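Replying to the earlier thread about multi-chain prediction with a worked example.

Input:
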Amino acid sequence: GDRVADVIESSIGDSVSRALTQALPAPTGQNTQVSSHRLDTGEVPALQAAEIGASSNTSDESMIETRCVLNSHSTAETTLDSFFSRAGLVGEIDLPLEGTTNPNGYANWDIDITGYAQMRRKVELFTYMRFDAEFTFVACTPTGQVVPQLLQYMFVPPGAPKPESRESLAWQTATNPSVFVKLTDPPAQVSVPFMSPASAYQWFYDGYPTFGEHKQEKDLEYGACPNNMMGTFSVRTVGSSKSKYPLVVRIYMRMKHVRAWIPRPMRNQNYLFKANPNYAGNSIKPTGTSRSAITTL
Amino acid sequence: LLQYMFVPPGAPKPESRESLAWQTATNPSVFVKLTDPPAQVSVPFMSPA
Amino acid sequence: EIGASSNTSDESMIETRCVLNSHSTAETTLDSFFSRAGLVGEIDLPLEGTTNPNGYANWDIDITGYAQMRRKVELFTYMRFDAEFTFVACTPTGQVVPQ
Amino acid sequence: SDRVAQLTIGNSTITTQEAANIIVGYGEWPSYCSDDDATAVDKPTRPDVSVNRFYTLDTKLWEKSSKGWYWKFPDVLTETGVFGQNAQFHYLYRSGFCIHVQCNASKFHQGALLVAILPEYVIGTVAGGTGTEDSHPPYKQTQPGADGFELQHPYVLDAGIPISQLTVCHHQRINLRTNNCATIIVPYMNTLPFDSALNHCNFGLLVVPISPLDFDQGATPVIPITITLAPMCSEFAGLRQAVTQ
Amino acid sequence: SHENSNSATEGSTINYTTINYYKDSYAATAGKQSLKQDPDKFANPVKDIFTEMAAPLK
Amino acid sequence: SHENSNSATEGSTINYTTINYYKDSYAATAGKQSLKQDPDKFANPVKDIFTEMAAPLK
Amino acid sequence: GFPTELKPGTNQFLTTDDGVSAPILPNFHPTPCIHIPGEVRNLLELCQVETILEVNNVPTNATSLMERLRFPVSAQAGKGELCAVFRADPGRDGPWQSTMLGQLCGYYTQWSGSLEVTFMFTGSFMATGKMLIAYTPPGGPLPKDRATAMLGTHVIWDFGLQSSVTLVIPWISNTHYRAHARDGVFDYYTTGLVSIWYQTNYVVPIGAPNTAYIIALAAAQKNFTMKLCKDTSHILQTASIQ
Amino acid sequence: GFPTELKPGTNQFLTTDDGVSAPILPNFHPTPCIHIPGEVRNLLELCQVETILEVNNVPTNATSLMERLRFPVSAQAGKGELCAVFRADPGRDGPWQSTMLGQLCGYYTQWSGSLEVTFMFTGSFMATGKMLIAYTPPGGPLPKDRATAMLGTHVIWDFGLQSSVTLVIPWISNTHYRAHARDGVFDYYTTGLVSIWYQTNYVVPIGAPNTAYIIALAAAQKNFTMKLCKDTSHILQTASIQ
Amino acid sequence: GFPTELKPGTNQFLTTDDGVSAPILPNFHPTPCIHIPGEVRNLLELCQV
Amino acid sequence: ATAMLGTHVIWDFGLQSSVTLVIPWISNTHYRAHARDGVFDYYTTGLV
Ligand SMILES: CCCCCCCCCCCCC/C=C/[C@H](O)[C@H](N)CO
Ligand SMILES: CCCCCCCCCCCCC/C=C/[C@H](O)[C@H](N)CO
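Result:
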């Protein structure tokens, strides 16, 4: 039991989060109210102190004579579902016959949705995002031709054996999930849960995963979060022999049940690499367009 | 296989088949085979007026 | 030497805090561990050769010919279940043909 | 009533007569880890006054040709006082912070600094300039400590992201004709309830001049910027030998 | 009716209305979210608030 | 409603919730099992149990 | 054999279709979610955030790209002279591209509501001055002088302890919503101009510097909404990523 | 002709899809089930079972493969010397591979909860001794001496009538769940080390043997769970079965 | 696997068929309609002109 | 850096031209005698 007064009157162990703000409903845009003229002293709503770090609480009712406007413009299309529940390209797998890419008939793809700029810049608006997903696989020939071929889409989680071939033993999918499809069918579409050991994925990780000295050898590890390495996507031509059709598998991901935290500045520079916020330092481009002078247009 | 992309005003139009606009991360799209029934989508009233 | 396992907890070995666990034991059940389709058989129907050159093939049902599903069932000595078999037919190359 | 402030935590006390206000980050004050959010079962040590107190790191000089500086948290306190021993002796760490930046100048001085908190401030590099080399930052740039590091390209924050949208995080301004202190209170921000203090840095602290310092010849040309920061609601768990990195 | 509550949003005070044909809740439709906002969390994150008509530096 | 109770689990006190479109119960979905456990059947299979704090060889 | 007829719209993948898909992992409960601060629920929480408006978007070289965040104000002859002028169009390629409003508007096709531009004076405590910040609604060409500009919506800003004024650019439009403008028939959706004029002068004592800078900060108001989500146009990627 | 539209996800065989299939034998009631003992309902009933941990996993020849189930303890100089050291990682390729926990964890991707290692002394009744069994949480390198190891979680075990102690390796982790570790960035999921040090000595009288062996037995605790079922990696099959 | 039989009239596009199609823009509320005069509700309003 | 680890005040000059550093009672003995160079440095109070 607690006897001394500094321990009885202590705020240690206050687990309850003390919040200043509260979320209120805003199904529509705020309505404008009627305003008249103001000719007094002391009350000066146009003057702010931006050094506070807050934003201006000035409205148009206090800057001009306004009318009543009953707004019925909905804020429903700015939600995170409506902004992210839109399938976009996150992956592309090529299965050729001759060449170097994948000449054996199988292809493993380390899952990362940071290889296509248009979906990456949408997620990197936040640093933490938690969601369930819906992946869709659009398979076709280079020319776009639909051909009579069977494939197997195996999810290889981390730790499970990756297939070293088409005739491999990992393809028996006794415990790993798999999808068999013909190219003549609609694209395969499966729903995936939130599968992180953490409470949210994170597109930016300011740190190293491992302890120890950090020399130039193990500097690749900077930024790598194992909580986002969700495993491997594998694909093959179901068969003991060589296929006759070249193939491409394109992967489209749609988020659902989205939560996000901590918005960030948006990428203005061209991406260069996967899971690396590097940029071209010689060819730094300004965020927008330029002028000849500041007094013109 | 084809891809029917709706490009609203302001969004980038594709300058080619290999273009970056086709990733349909935010624009709506429909993928269809010609062997399928014709694609059929419903559209709302989308005017600022 | 009793042959039992230790009934010692971490509350008795270290000074512990309260942890309100909400980690579910639902994925360790035998349904969730075995209700996952895996290869138990493969039948080849060639034209020339020795395997089955006549156009028919009989397969004595035993799911002990593929190591990845066998080692899952041989964790137990007795198992009672209803099943769901699925037959994925194709050419050697994986080509779907009108047959 | 709002330009004066006294910040007392521990055995430490800051006065300011020319303040703006206090920024409480994301409208959350720092707190302790609840039993629902917790997963580790060891009892954490909560040293109230020996680690939750104001620490003063160093002093950067605002010159005309300045570009900016960043500091990474909690790397700034991993070699300092009792905090940087509990953090080395333990494996897990949880804390908020009160950052407080000081820059004094006269009434005949002009300039502005953006003082901002950027979570998970991952550091990119110029990639050889051409963008072909997949270069990486060394350890003395991602965890630079209490000395901080000088921004090479502060327009993109050395991460390809514009400085102009950085007010979407926490921030204050130090406008020398209005204020000389900038006080931000940051909670613990991570996907996990605890994490390592030596491997992972939760956020960065940027100090960038948007408007450049100017004065006429005769005034005090040394205008220092001093970083002063206090942990809040600190917690440590998982005790073993002291390792530094 | 009886279903695994194993979506990514189970555990929040926001009320959804999804459609599902499976036992897993994460396979469901995304649905309509609640139209609640908290702009002061980013736009007015100050300890001691100020009103509009007043001069804040007081 | 009226259906052949001819699954492999009919005849146990564990309650399932399956979906079926046929008259045979074994065609149904697997469903959710009951989350009951008996570790002492393998981990403490002793005639005369012992408590934690006590020395067992007494 | 419940008889059905398959209708058109069959075996197509529409990316914005929200339906039920098949789950891969049955009886998977995810990791619980702890309380993380900074939870976003609507992007209009961020459009109401003040971010820096790059009015002086003249320099391009890397040596002088931080100069784009503040524009100068100096001593003049007292003739009501012009400091700066820019468009009030967020989606148009100009100063607003630097803002979080001007980048989240790329992902939406139609916007409505009032804006908010906050200018902060970053000069000496001893420097004084008065400025006229005029919003010129559409039709109005670029005003050639201050007399033509005070006929519009305007604020006269007196420098002082409160170093910041807010010009509210209010919703003065024919359409309920407004799309993105550009040179052509989409100038129908132009919002107007914003100009800054010297009212009196920038008066400074001896010993203080003769020049200062003003940092503009632009956001949106509580009546602001966006509509018809799309893909952004004013940022593009050179191909061959990684 | 009830009109329908077929959505994507059509005519695919997803192995982890639980639906209704067509029955081959109508009006088939199976054989009744008698009461068989040993009914399993959850694999966590078996993760809580003590199985032998192969600490001394040095020998490989068939002549000496039973030596892997017990490790020696002998007479020392009384300098706090080291007997054995091993990782507390079940999924990592090492001593825990011999356990039922370390083989059922191959079929799962993420684990959480406390472990349990039980060491039994298999010496003479007359032999005495005291040992320090230290669990070193992560970050901590291999302790070079006993002084560096007693700073961690530890048990001092006195041999006696009760020939067995239990070191509980408790859940001390940043993540709620923990995946399988290996040399690389998945060392982020390392659990720590476990070391055994001589506290006093192995004291033995004249006539008794100067050497004994200790058998380690490893299990899991009541807070242990696994998640995200997969296929096992640390056992593989040379092809051409039968 | 709810069993069904597909009947004839399948995978045809009948132009005067009024059914539900898939929407491209979820959570899209259109612009409100102001009172415009001259609203037609039936063409027999104009045959009487 | 070695001094901010103690009890300290940061004083900003302004209108209020005066700060007060309170040197608080941090002592082993309830009372404290006068110190000097020798064994009565046991009663030293510290530095400022
Ligand atoms: C046939 C089954 C296929 C199912 C495959 C689904 C894979 C599930 C992964 C979804 C989660 C992706 C999250 C990715 C995060 C980022 O890529 C990482 N932070 C890497 O930068
Ligand atoms: C078109 C109808 C095809 C239906 C064929 C289904 C066959 C039913 C058999 C399922 C039960 C398999 C149990 C097998 C057990 C082991 O193989 C034996 N102990 C042999 O080692």
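Chain H has three helices and 14 strands.

Feel free to reuse this layout for your own posts.
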